[PDB]
Amino acid sequence: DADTEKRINVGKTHLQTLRNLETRCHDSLQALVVIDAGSSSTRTNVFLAKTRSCPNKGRSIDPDSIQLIREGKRFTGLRVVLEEWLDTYAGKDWESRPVDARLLFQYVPQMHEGAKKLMQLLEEDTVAILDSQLNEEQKVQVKALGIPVMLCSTAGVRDFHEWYRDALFVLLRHLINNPSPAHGYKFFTNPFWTRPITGAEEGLFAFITLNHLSRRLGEDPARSMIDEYGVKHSRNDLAGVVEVGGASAQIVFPLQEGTVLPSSVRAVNLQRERLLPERYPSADVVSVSFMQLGMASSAGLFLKELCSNDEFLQGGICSNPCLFKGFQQSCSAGEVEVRPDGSASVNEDVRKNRLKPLATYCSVHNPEISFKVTNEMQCRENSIDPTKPLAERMKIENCSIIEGTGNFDKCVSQVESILVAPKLPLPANIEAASSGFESVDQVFRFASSTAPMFITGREMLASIDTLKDHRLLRSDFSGDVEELAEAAREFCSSEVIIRTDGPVIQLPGEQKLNSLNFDLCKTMALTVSLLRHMAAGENQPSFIKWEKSIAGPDGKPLADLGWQVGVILHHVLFTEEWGRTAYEAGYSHNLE
Amino acid sequence: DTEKRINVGKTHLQTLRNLETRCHDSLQALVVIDAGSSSTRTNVFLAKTRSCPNKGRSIDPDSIQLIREGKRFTGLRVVLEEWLDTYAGKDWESRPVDARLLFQYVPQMHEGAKKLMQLLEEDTVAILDSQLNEEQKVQVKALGIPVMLCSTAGVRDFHEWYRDALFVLLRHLINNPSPAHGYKFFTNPFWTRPITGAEEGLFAFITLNHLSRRLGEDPARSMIDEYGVKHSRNDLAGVVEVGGASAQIVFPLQEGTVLPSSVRAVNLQRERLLPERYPSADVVSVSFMQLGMASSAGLFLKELCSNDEFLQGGICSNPCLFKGFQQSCSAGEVEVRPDGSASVNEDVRKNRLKPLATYCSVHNPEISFKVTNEMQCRENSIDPTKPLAERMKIENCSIIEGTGNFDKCVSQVESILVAPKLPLPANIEAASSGFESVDQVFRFASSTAPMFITGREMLASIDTLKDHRLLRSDFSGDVEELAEAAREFCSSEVIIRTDGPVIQLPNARGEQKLNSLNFDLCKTMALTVSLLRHMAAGENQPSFIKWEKSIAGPDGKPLADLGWQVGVILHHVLFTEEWGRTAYEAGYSHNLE
Ligand SMILES: Nc1ncnc2c1ncn2[C@@H]1O[C@H](COP(=O)(O)OP(=O)(O)NP(=O)(O)O)[C@@H](O)[C@H]1O
Ligand SMILES: [Mg+2]
Ligand SMILES: [Mg+2]
């Protein structure tokens, strides 16, 4: 009788288990792809998120479950793809000749083949990442749901003349929407996901990534709070970001208490401008991006302006204060390779020349110069003559060899007058000027916040880490200007000794000289000048932090800092709109 | 010095910037008109509305509080019966009446309903004027007053089209109030409508769980499991409500309690009673006609005094009436006079067997075409062929004498009201949910959910025994503890003293004055025993049985009274988008020319 009544409950549980399955929510794994089509390269970023489907509630993504599985190989940039197409279909050296844009329309199928070659590489790489990281059970869930692809171009093609860029984006979307059926991964896109993103957007998404990963941004009671007047506020202060890329630099910070700004200065409300949903806590954010401020673009422009000044150029010898004592290189903006024998190899290839994007923009044949006098004077003040041919524009006139003086104070003074606070704004910065900021100094002058700042960038971090490693800066570094300027002054004024082990930076410790650290003093001066303006502003940040990636709750980092996670959250957090485009329409939309 | 001076102006802008960005709270009045069996009364409520930028206006469910239940005016049944008395001729209950011919008397029905609506409107305004201050009056008048008039057991069994036609007229009368008072009353066919017995019970369940803080969508009252399903932190409690003409038995089904195919349970979310954001529950809701205080009192006297075991030589021996108590043999209203005598009102309107005898007529299509309903009437001693007066008359009976036997009273309440052979008349709704009678409820469906008893006399049955120290101060709801206490109380003698009739308890326990409310309380005491007997017989037994009048709020003061009133408000207000469209977007402005 005991085992008879026991069997009855087993069958009762059997129905209850089945009844629970049909009423509860079911979690499935989904892959998300963000293709960073930057200045330096075009690379894939494979993410994984947990989807939850509930009866009568549809399917949604858990924002906290969003984690990067791998950032793919660095393939050819969109600028190179478009420039190669113009080299073969508009003739070689089109930069110095007047080109009829109307005639290029007959070469659209040929642009499709150029883009196809790059897209096939990115597709092959994405599949290789998914196949290596996902198990058979995970692969089935990933393949069934479809893979939303978001290809966003940044500073690389931001300044690109005529139609070309926008026409390429129409072709890029068709290539994503038509993937290889062999792999099984259902990649799909739309003009809302795959599109060129603005400098403000690039900065705003980078802000969303930082606050999401650091658990400062959220709509739950753990990260937010509803006051007695029904307004949602975040429990922790929202942090701002400074991202220094290859071609552009972004300065992003939220305004505390809604500080009164001038009419010319334009701040962006995250809810009002549809960046974050209404359920999220509101914030008015200042987001500005500066062209010719990124690692490579600033490096080329600085050499052009410094070696054009009579104070630094004497008898074909340009004295650079941002380069170490004893360092010698050719007078060009071309990529510098520090060879094992101490010598500096300067590649004079047009594609590899750091001035190239600026000299291509600064052309009398580009409608932004021929019709707009303001843009012509912006080029001419930075020594680029738009009338002159491409080679003559990139060439540092009456200069043969660049010698390193190692004076840090003189380097700060020059980074300030050229890059940070110039007379006229740096070329291709109409977006920044329309926000009310002609230059970096104007940012903290007109808009200031008591919100903590996060400095992001390979060289930005390297500048601080190098000084920390040699015991020039404390392990705990709040972001003191004088403390940094004293440490860098002692480091930049150190002799280069060519020894057996190669070129060594001799300090009263020692570090080897390479292609990444040879000009780090320009970035050290940039950090000093940047922190000087932050300390000059009416409102000062609570703390300044230098970070590569944010550590997750388990200890391991969830994702890397940048606009990647921000662009995902910009789409996924709008529950109804995401469900209609990613799940209702889906990959099935592409079917014939 | 000037730093503090510029800060005043900076604060001046911040204060103004906060006002536009923040939410603003305004007071709104809500009206629920209980158009029950016994009477038609207004219930004035007050709620806090919150308007937020881009979020519209919503009501805080927890802010809903009863300010006053108004005067008890004429029931909808009386209004319609008076109209038939004058427009279909007197004694229409015993004659065949052509319903088609009554359509020419619709404007005349409007005047009859207007008279009642003007009284209810005047009373509602009198409550609002006495409780609200000038600042409160402005907010209340500006937002408009949603009115929800719902009919129950009174017109639930009403024959032909008349009831539904009255409701079309009632809504027009609400939508057109006196502009002099300033209160903007408005209604719609979704708010003002006859509510079903299951709905009446379901709303009473929603009221109980809301006030006792068992039902909520917030983390304080609810919890989300690892599979995204919202469960309530505390067990949802069931309710037993005993009105004038009907009794409701409501309880939620705990766990995977498998029910038969014939038995119909209602899921609150699926049947659009509560929003999806609220925790789900499968609820058994059943209402029984002829079980309410007034209707059950009449039916019991008819069935008991028709049985040869209780009727001898014109003297009906009632076990539910005290020893020495004497009254005339009729279901009419009993008034206990100061000289110990029982005055029985022989007026047709005041007779408690009238609604049952009016339904049990061969001229009513529910009897003439449906043989099943005729046999339901005949088994309860009502002959549908006989005239109205002959139906209400207890044949071959002159005087009702009180025997005071509690065990015999329980046995009779059981066979007549609780578990009869055929279902009690006008109970098609109950039978369609799978319950022909009260005994069948706990036999087919049982729950481990705590039960709450509601009804003036149901509470009085417990309180009287508690007062005489027959029942403990702390009473969990033990069946045999109650039966022992009531048996000693019901066996009590009635002594006609200089002060009046007194209930003399045996073994010199105590004494209390006999009145028109407690003379037949032993029938209700037996009803409570029989009801608890079936609850204890069921597969699943409630955790505790509680007897409550009203639920005490967080401040200690009670927010509102128990019943279907708060439940019907929450049924509409909790659907944020739908409520905002009907109450605020359309509003009283919809009524404008
Ligand atoms: N003023 C009163 N307040 C409360 N109960 C009363 C009052 N007057 C009479 N009663 C008693 O309570 C019963 C009516 O209760 P009530 O709550 O008004 O239900 P109802 O609306 O008339 N019936 P129903 O149509 O089924 O909803 C009467 O039969 C009396 O026993
Ligand atoms: Mg970038
Ligand atoms: Mg009622």
Side-chain angles (χ1 to χ4, degrees), chain A residues 195-210:
Chain A
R195 61 167 184 95
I197 56 157
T198 70
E201 283 182 310
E202 194 193 331
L204 278 151
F205 301 148
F207 165 86
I208 292 152
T209 304
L210 169 72

Side-chain angles (χ1 to χ4, degrees), chain A residues 201-222:
Chain A
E201 283 182 310
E202 194 193 331
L204 278 151
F205 301 148
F207 165 86
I208 292 152
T209 304
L210 169 72
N211 290 285
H212 173 79
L213 296 169
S214 61
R215 299 190 84 91
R216 290 174 192 267
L217 192 81
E219 62 94 21
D220 58 358

